[PDB]
Design a protein around this ligand. Structure first.
Ligand SMILES: OC[C@H]1O[C@H](O[C@H]2[C@H](O)[C@@H](O)[C@@H](O[C@H]3[C@H](O)[C@@H](O)[C@@H](O[C@H]4[C@H](O)[C@@H](O)[C@@H](O[C@H]5[C@H](O)[C@@H](O)[C@@H](O[C@H]6[C@H](O)[C@@H](O)[C@@H](O)O[C@@H]6CO)O[C@@H]5CO)O[C@@H]4CO)O[C@@H]3CO)O[C@@H]2CO)[C@H](O)[C@@H](O)[C@@H]1O
Ligand SMILES: OC[C@H]1O[C@H](O[C@H]2[C@H](O)[C@@H](O)[C@@H](O[C@H]3[C@H](O)[C@@H](O)[C@@H](O[C@H]4[C@H](O)[C@@H](O)[C@@H](O)O[C@@H]4CO)O[C@@H]3CO)O[C@@H]2CO)[C@H](O)[C@@H](O)[C@@H]1O
Ligand SMILES: [Ca+2]
Ligand SMILES: [Cl-]
Length: 496
């Protein structure tokens, strides 16, 4: 039985970006920028035919209610999808499909994004086709409303309806065949892998049966005999009967503890200290790095969906702390890193819940999506922020080097290197620090890539606040002058 947790990237590329609700034409155009900045790939929103919800008007979450496995979605047509995949693959930037296999729609009836009808009440999905026999039901789920309530009951979690979403019978050969045909069609077009939605709600044995039906990647671009890359969404913050460790034998698993812990640390919640990150990773009770897909925030928890709440996870709304957490995550050596890329919406937290957590992407009406224009107040484009992409370059130069030359002052300042390739100093204190440290880097003149454009003089001041150059002495020490406040961190590194 094959393992699907290994990704495939061009040399010098590694980090993934979730281009949440981006249209295919925009992702196709973005792949040139992503390749130039040595990102490895893109997670795309569910591309199959999905529900069109008009009350409320065209929420993002309509794409998590499949109507069929045809390929006309809010992000564009099948033609536009295949154009995107071909162009991106040709640039060495790969595509990971948000694959929604646990369920179809909730209740009610309507027309999906490709003109096929559905009826959640009668369990009729003629575009597939699925009927009542293809779903779990009262024989499989004994809760009074048929929905999931008790996360200490694995059978309930896996056989009942997640928030009323009609729950497919993943044990049936027909459903396994239909879902593998969908995945294999995507793979045949050049898709490199999948973010598998709601895997906590599916039996690992059913996922194993589906994955065992997959074809290997398309050799127009990928090496012969290469399994697709599979990472599985399982929210495991402890204290439940379904565990992430149940899924790691199939592929990687989303490590939600990672963003919870880094959010709490950088926020200094309940007396947390940055110095505690000295052993961050598996030693914090998390998955092994090889098993983990890691990220500061995702499309659910930036808007309170999933575990819930707004006092821990860091997002673009907390931009300064968010950059600190992401910089640490990119400079560290733990997990496959995914960066969220968001759109703005009128987040309105009332009694701990965002009342507008349903709002979809920038739109002119009718359920369309507007062309991306980064930094216009509608598209956030975190992956295009200099502090992000320069730390992606830092991360790339550092690939294969362990953490070295760790230093901490005991509280909210840390520093560490990656072999002889890069060094970062993070000052999360409310004061300024002047500290000479062994960097492990060759002597020379370096630029702070958090504030400057380049890694060596001329440093480049496109952001307007490029700091004075950092001198690494012949002995490898450098004196770091890091004021507290905005971007309170200095990162330096060598060239490839
Ligand atoms: O139709 C009848 C039906 O109406 C109501 O339900 C509807 C609901 O109000 C409406 O918002 C929508 O549901 C959305 C959902 O709100 C969105 O979040 C989105 O859900 C997908 C999500 O984006 C995915 O990333 C993925 O995340 C899931 C996890 O896989 C789950 O495990 C679960 O996390 C739980 C976690 O595991 C636990 O440890 C604990 O922390 O609690 C968490 C749950 O709070 O939830 C997350 C986040 O949703 O999977 C989701 C599904 O793909 O998209 C949904 C579909 O559009 O549609 C509902 C159906 O109409 C009403 O509430 C029902 O009672 C009623 O039967
Ligand atoms: O070439 C395009 C642009 O490049 C340069 O802009 C950079 C910035 O120098 C970076 O600092 C960063 O900008 C982020 C910023 O770090 C982040 O804090 C956030 O700022 C928001 C803020 O959250 C919000 O409160 C409010 O004040 O609006 C700010 C943004 O206007 O988001 C910024 C990105 O929008 O990344 C950009 C792009 O790399 C250069 O300075 C620009 O002149 C240039 O157009
Ligand atoms: Ca299920
Ligand atoms: Cl996810």
């Amino acid at each position: 039985f094959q393992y699907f947790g290994s990704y495939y990237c061009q040399p010098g590329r590694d980090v993934i970006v979730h281009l949440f609700e981006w249209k295919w034409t925009d992702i196709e155009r973005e792949c040139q920028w992503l390749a130039d900045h040595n990102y490895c790939g893109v997670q795309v929103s569910p591309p199959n035919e999905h529900r069109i919800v008009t009350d409320p008007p065209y929420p993002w979450w309509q794409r998590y209610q499949p109507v069929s496995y045809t390929m006309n979605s809010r992000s564009g047509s099948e033609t536009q999808f295949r154009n995107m995949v071909t162009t991106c693959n040709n640039l060495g930037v790969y595509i990971y499909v948000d694959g929604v296999l646990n369920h179809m729609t909730g209740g009610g009836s309507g027309t999906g994004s490709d003109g096929n009808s559905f009826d959640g009440d009668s369990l009729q999905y003629p575009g597939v086709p699925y009927g009542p026999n293809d779903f779990h039901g009262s024989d499989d789920c004994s809760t009074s409303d048929g929905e999931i309530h008790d996360y200490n009951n694995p059978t309930e979690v896996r056989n009942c309806r997640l928030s009323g979403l009609r729950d497919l019978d993943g044990s049936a050969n027909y459903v396994r065949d239909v879902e593998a045909e969908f995945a294999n069609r995507l793979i045949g077009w050049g898709v490199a892998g999948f973010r598998l939605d709601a895997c906590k709600h599916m039996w690992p044995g059913d996922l194993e049966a589906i994955l065992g039906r997959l074809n290997q990647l398309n050799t127009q671009w990928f090496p012969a005999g290469r399994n697709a890359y599979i990472y599985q969404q399982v929210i495991d913050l402890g204290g439940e009967a379904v565990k992430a460790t149940e899924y790691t034998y199939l592929g990687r698993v989303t490590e939600f503890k990672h963003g919870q812990n880094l959010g709490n640390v950088v926020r200094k919640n309940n007396g947390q200290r940055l110095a505690n990150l000295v052993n961050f990773g598996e030693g914090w009770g998390q998955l092994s790095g090889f098993d983990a897909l890691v990220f500061i925030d995702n499309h659910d928890n930036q808007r309170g969906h999933g575990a819930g709440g707004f006092g821990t996870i860091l997002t673009f709304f907390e931009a300064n702390m968010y950059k600190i957490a992401t910089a640490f995550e990119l400079a560290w050596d733990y997990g496959h890193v995914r960066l969220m890329s968001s759109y703005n919406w009128p987040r309105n937290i009332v009694n701990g819940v965002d009342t507008n957590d349903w709002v979809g992407p920038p739109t002119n009406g009718g359920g369309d999506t507007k062309d991306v224009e980064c930094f216009n107040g509608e598209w956030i484009c975190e992956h295009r922020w200099r502090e992000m992409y320069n730390m992606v370059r830092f991360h790339n130069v550092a690939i294969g080097n362990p953490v070295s030359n760790w230093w901490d002052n005991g509280f909210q300042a840390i520093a560490f290197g990656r072999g002889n390739r890069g060094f970062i100093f993070i000052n999360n204190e409310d004061f300024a620090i002047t500290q000479t440290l062994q960097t492990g880097l060759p002597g020379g003149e370096y630029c702070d890539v958090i504030s400057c454009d380049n890694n060596r003089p001329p440093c480049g001041n496109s952001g307007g606040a490029c700091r004075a150059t950092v001198i690494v002495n012949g002995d490898g020490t450098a004196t770091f002058d890091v004021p507290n406040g905005e971007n309170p961190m200095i990162a330096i590194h060598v060239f490839l």
